[PDB]
């Protein structure tokens, strides 16, 4: 009868049922229990298999104006893992074309809804109607040039690259 039966939740994060609920299920192979745990994602996704460069036939999804090739971070390049369909790589948007098309304000929490090749705000694109945010109206909080999208998607061992141990 160790007495202080109500406690601090002292030992969470030191468990094996935890070690399986801390992983991330990203787009890699990394069978499981081998992905990173605390930050949830490995830094520096190496992509030597496919070079992951910005294309030349690139254009804004929302606006459609051609986008500067790579000399700049004026474009928000969302590579949705392996995308292919939006462009050779994923959706492309100049930082100022990254607003909801239908309601015309920012995409709150940056989750957008590609409505027929014009990014729509999830809430409007979902039917809801509350149509003005508080902080910054016509410009999202997003990072530029995939720098905010590299928390997820295609870490180094995409696919079964067993070429490494085989003869």
């Amino acid at each position: 009868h160790g007495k202080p039966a109500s406690g601090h939740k002292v030992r969470t994060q030191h468990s094996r049922r935890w070690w399986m609920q801390s992983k991330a299920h990203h787009l890699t192979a990394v069978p499981h229990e081998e992905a990173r745990s605390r930050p949830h994602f490995p830094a520096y996704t190496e992509d030597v298999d496919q070079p992951m460069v910005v294309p030349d036939g690139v254009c804004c999804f929302n606006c459609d104006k051609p986008i500067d090739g790579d000399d700049i971070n004026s474009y928000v390049w969302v590579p949705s893992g392996n995308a292919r369909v939006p462009t050779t790589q994923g959706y492309f948007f100049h930082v100022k074309c990254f607003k909801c098309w239908n309601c015309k304000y920012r995409i709150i929490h940056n989750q957008f809804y590609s409505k027929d090749s014009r990014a729509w705000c999830l809430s409007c694109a979902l039917g809801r109607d509350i149509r003005v945010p508080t902080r910054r109206w016509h410009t999202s909080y997003v990072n530029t040039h995939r720098t905010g999208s590299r928390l997820t998607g295609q870490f180094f061992p995409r696919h079964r690259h067993q070429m490494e141990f085989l003869f």
């Binding site: 000399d71 700049i72 004026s74 930082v95 309601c103 709150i108 929490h109 989750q111 999830l122 809430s123 979902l126 809801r128 109607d129 509350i130 149509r131 003005v132 945010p133 508080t134 902080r135 910054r136 109206w137 016509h138 410009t139």
Partner: protein, 176 residues
């Protein structure tokens, strides 16, 4: 502590409490899923959710259509700080037909003062590289003049720059 009603826009990060909880960042991405998923969460924002109660009475039906946003001109004319008896929308208008104009509340003007100081920041960085794309870009262009003028000089003066030995130690292509 600098009551939030003083800040032009209410602050982004909102510190709370909780002696037994230590984390600066407010947990967004949870305040987002609720609200997007549940319609009721956010008060109807009277107009877009009035205009029923005025269609039902005058038409005998549920409106059964998407309500127009941007409240009609003439609604909420006695209200002064609507901002809640609405969405964060502006006070709609007078009961006029003049082109819509934002009533320049102290808030709207501040947003103008952001979207100019956003264009200001993205402009001081966009060209700090544009000139960093000359300094290092032209330093290399000049450095190769150096290795050329060193390349020319190191042939007449014959300094092979490959050790005390003659090239006969090189031709082996060993270490030596």
């Amino acid at each position: 502590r600098k009551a939030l009603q003083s800040y032009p826009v209410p602050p982004r990060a909102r510190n709370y409490e909780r002696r037994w909880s230590s984390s600066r960042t407010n947990p967004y991405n949870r305040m987002f899923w609720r609200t997007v998923l549940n319609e009721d969460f956010a008060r109807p924002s009277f107009w877009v959710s009035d205009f029923r109660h005025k269609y039902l009475a005058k038409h005998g039906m549920d409106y059964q259509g998407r309500v127009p946003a941007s409240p009609a001109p003439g609604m909420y004319q006695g209200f002064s700080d609507v901002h809640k008896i609405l969405a964060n929308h502006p006070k709609p208008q007078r009961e006029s037909r003049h082109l819509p104009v934002m009533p320049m509340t102290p808030r709207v003007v501040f947003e103008h003062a952001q979207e100019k100081r956003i264009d200001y920041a993205k402009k001081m960085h966009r060209d700090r590289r544009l000139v960093e794309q000359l300094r290092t870009h032209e330093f290399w262009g000049w450095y190769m003049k150096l290795q050329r003028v060193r390349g020319r000089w190191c042939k007449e003066h014959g300094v092979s720059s490959r050790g005390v030995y003659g090239p006969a130690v090189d031709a082996a292509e060993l270490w030596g």
